[PDB]
Design a protein around this ligand. Structure first.
Ligand SMILES: O=c1ccn([C@@H]2O[C@H](COP(=O)(O)O)[C@@H](O)[C@H]2O)c(=O)[nH]1
Ligand SMILES: O=c1ccn([C@@H]2O[C@H](COP(=O)(O)O)[C@@H](O)[C@H]2O)c(=O)[nH]1
Ligand SMILES: [K+]
Lengths: 316, 316
C-alpha cells in the first residue's frame, strides 16, 4: 500500500533504533539518515492506519502560502498547532498579568490543577489575539516561521525575497533546473531561535512533465509528527504542480534524525498491527490556479477511510 | 566492498535514468532522490576501481577549513580545480588585454588553435595571482565559495558567522543535538551566482560516541564529480571526529539530481567491469588537533591501490 514506507520506517526505528537522549528529557530510539518516496499518482499519502486531521494540515499550509506569520488566521480556522509559541511571548512579557506559567509545558502534563489554569490564560490569549487588533499584532505575530522564510526572506540590504514565488517562476521558465531549492535555514537567526526549522529545505524536480519534490527534515517525531509532515509536503507538491500546469510525480522525504519517543512505543506497536486501506484522493479547484490565493474550499480530500485515531502523550 | 554503493548508483542511473536535458547543452540520464551510506570504520571511500587524486581533494578541503577564498593557496599546491571561476573575472574585466576568451569553455573543447591560446592566458593568469599580491587580491579572490559560507557567513548587520566553528563547539557541548547543521545556500546570493553551491548543506550526528555526517547534494555528476564529493565529505567527517575526540560513524550522501552525462557512457560501463579492491586507510596526525590549522602533511592515506585512471570529456 502507499503508506507502507512510513510503517517500514516505524519498524526500522523499533529494531535498529539506538536509545539516544533528547532535549525534552524524554528518551528516544533514533536513526540518522533515511529516505522514503511516495508516488503521488497512486494516491494521497494521508495515513489510513490512523486518523490524521487534514483540516489542520490544510489550513496551516495555506497560512504558509500566504506568507502569513500571525496566529490569528490559524485560530480563525480552529487551528491551535502554533498557539504555544505565541503564548510563550505573552507570558514572558512585562504587560502579562496572571498566574505563573513558568514551564507550562511539562508542568501541565503533570499537575491537573495547573493544567486547568493553563487552559484558561490560553483561552483568554486566543480571544484577545482574535478580537484585539493591536494585541494580535504584538503577540499574535511569530515573525520567523515558514511563511516568512518561504515568502519574505530578509536580505542584508533590508529587502525581502519571495523564495517560493521566485522558484515557481523558475519551474515555468526552466523546468529542467537543478537549482529549484527553497531553504528555511538561516544561519544568522538559528542560534536565537527556540525552534530552528525542522523542515530545513526542499527541492523541486521536473522530468517527463511530472513534478517531484524532495524534503530534507533534520529532526522528526516518527509517531506524532511524521504523519502530518508527509501530508503537508505531498499537498504542497500538488498545489505547485497545479499552478505550473504539471502532473505530479513523487514526494521524497529525507531524514536526518528520525526518532520515536519512549512513551509512543505501545501505540506505534498497535498501529503496526493494522492493515492499510486504499489511499484517499486529493481534488483541487480546476478554475483557480494562483495557489497563493487558495482557500480551504479549493482543496478537497475524497475517499479517506481511516482506522480510529491513536492518542499519545506529547514530549516536552 | 565499501565503494559498492557508488557502483550501484551508476548502474541505477544507467537502467532507470531518464534522459533529461542540461545547462551545458550536453545530455544526461538522471534520477531524483537517492541516498547511500559509507561505514567509515570499514575504510576510507576513495574509489579503487578508478584512480582519484587525493592530493586535490585534500588541499581543497583545507583551503575550505581555513575559510580561504583565494585561488592563490590552491595554485601553490598545484590545485587548479577553481582556476576557471577566477579566470573568468579576469577576462571580463576592463583591465584585461589579450585574445578574446568568450566562452573559452566549450570553445577550447572544440578548436585546438584556441585551446592553445587559452592555456596561455591562463598560464599567465596563474602566474600573476601567484606573484602579484594586488593582482591576487583582486582576481584571485572568489568571494562566495565554501570557505566563506562555512567560516564567514555574512549577516544583515554587517558581521560574519563562523558556522562550522560554532557547530564544532556544539558537538563538544551538546553531542545529542539535532541542530548540528551547516548550510551553504544563501537565498540572497544564489540568484546572482554563476554556480549556487552543489553541496547545499550537511548535518552531523552523534550516538554511542560515533560521529556521522549527512550531505545533501542538489546536483551531481555521477562520473567525474561524485568520486571526489565522497572523499571530501568522508574526509571532513574524519577531521571533525578527530577534533571532537570522537570515533567515526558513517557518511550518508543524499542526492537531489544525480546525473550521468551522455559522453560518459562507455567510460562508466568500463569502470563497472572492474572489481573493487580493499579500501585504503586514512591516518591523521595524533599530536595536532585544531583541524583549522591542519596542513597537507597532517593527513596521510595508507594502502590505496587503484585501477588506472579513466579519462573522460568534461561537459561545458
Ligand atoms: O511537524 C513537525 C514539527 C516538529 N517535529 C518534531 O519537534 C521536535 C523539535 O525539536 P528538535 O529536536 O528539532 O530540536 C522534534 O521531535 C521534531 C516533527 O516531527 N514534525
Ligand atoms: O564537485 C563537484 C562539483 C560539481 N558537480 C557538478 O557540476 C555541475 C554544476 O551545475 P548545475 O547543474 O548544478 O547547475 C553539475 O553537474 C554538478 C559535481 O558533481 N561535483
Ligand atoms: K540555507
Amino acid at each position: 500500500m502507499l503508506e507502507q514506507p512510513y510503517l517500514d520506517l516505524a519498524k526500522k526505528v523499533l529494531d535498529e533504533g539506538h536509545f539516544k537522549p533528547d532535549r525534552t528529557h524524554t528518551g528516544t530510539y533514533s536513526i540518522f539518515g533515511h529516505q522514503m518516496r511516495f508516488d503521488l499518482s497512486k494516491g494521497f499519502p494521508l495515513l489510513t492506519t490512523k486518523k490524521v486531521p487534514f483540516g489542520l494540515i490544510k489550513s496551516e499550509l495555506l497560512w504558509f502560502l500566504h506568507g502569513d506569520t500571525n496566529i490569528r488566521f490559524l485560530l480563525q480556522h480552529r487551528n491551535h498547532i502554533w498557539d504555544e509559541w505565541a503564548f510563550e511571548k505573552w507570558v514572558k512579557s512585562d504587560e502579562y498579568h496572571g498566574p505563573d506559567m513558568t514551564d507550562f509545558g511539562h508542568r501541565s502534563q503533570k499537575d491537573p490543577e495547573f493544567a486547568a489554569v493553563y487552559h484558561e490564560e490560553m483561552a483568554k490569549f486566543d480571544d484577545r489575539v482574535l478580537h484585539d487588533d493591536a494585541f494580535a499584532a504584538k503577540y499574535g505575530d511569530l515573525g520567523l516561521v515558514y511563511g516568512s522564510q518561504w515568502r519574505a526572506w530578509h536580505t542584508s540590504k533590508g529587502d525581502t525575497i519571495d523564495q517560493l514565488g521566485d522558484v515557481i517562476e523558475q519551474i515555468k521558465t526552466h523546468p529542467y533546473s537543478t537549482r529549484l531549492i527553497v531553504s528555511a535555514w538561516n544561519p544568522e537567526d538559528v542560534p536565537t531561535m527556540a525552534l530552528p526549522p525542522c523542515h530545513t529545505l526542499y527541492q523541486f524536480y521536473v522530468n517527463d512533465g511530472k513534478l517531484s519534490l524532495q524534503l530534507y527534515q533534520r529532526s522528526a517525531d516518527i509517531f506524532l509528527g511524521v504523519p502530518f509532515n508527509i501530508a503537508s509536503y505531498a499537498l504542497l507538491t500538488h498545489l505547485v504542480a497545479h499552478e505550473c500546469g504539471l502532473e505530479v510525480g513523487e514526494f521524497i522525504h529525507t531524514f536526518g534524525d528520525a526518532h520515536l519517543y519512549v512513551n509512543h512505543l505501545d501505540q506505534i506497536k498497535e498501529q503496526l498491527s493494522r492493515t492499510p486501506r486504499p489511499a484517499p484522493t486529493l481534488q483541487l479547484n480546476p478554475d483557480k490556479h494562483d495557489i497563493f490565493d487558495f482557500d480551504m474550499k479549493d482543496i478537497k480530500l475524497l475517499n479517506y477511510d481511516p482506522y480510529p485515531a491513536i492518542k499519545a502523550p506529547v514530549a516536552v
